[PDB]
């Protein structure tokens, strides 16, 4: 749903690199590989953490019982 705190395979913290990854892809016209390299994700175990995240929580957040629409 939301970005994992740590890479499963090794344990490197990657939860602080999701908004940064989206911003790197968005403003700077970068490909995914270069953006991942700039974030410091070297091993592919860490690279597929942010490369393949779907970020489903946003789709969850639009259904809000506690606020009128």
């Amino acid at each position: 749903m939301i970005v994992p705190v740590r890479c499963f395979s090794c344990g490197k913290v990657v939860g602080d690199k999701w908004e940064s990854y989206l911003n790197l892809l968005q403003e700077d016209e970068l490909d995914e590989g270069t953006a991942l390299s700039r974030l410091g994700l070297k091993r592919y175990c860490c690279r597929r953490m942010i490369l393949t995240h779907v970020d489903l929580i946003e789709k969850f957040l639009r259904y809000n019982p506690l606020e009128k629409r």
């Binding site: 989206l22 892809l25 995914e32 393949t52 779907v54 970020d55 789709k59 639009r62």
Partner: protein, 49 residues
């Protein structure tokens, strides 16, 4: 290299944030249930009432 797919991350997350207000993306997902939708819709509309 020609066997190239792509993660549409910028496209996907934007659509997550704001759903389309005109029509649903992935029109092929509506043609899967057409044999049901268009079948039920055929007993109330179409030619001959």
């Amino acid at each position: 290299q020609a066997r190239t797919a792509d993660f549409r991350t910028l496209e996907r997350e934007s659509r997550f944030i704001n759903p389309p207000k005109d029509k649903s993306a992935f029109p092929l997902l509506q043609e899967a249930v057409q044999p049901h939708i268009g079948s039920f819709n055929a007993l109330t509309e179409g030619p001959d009432g």
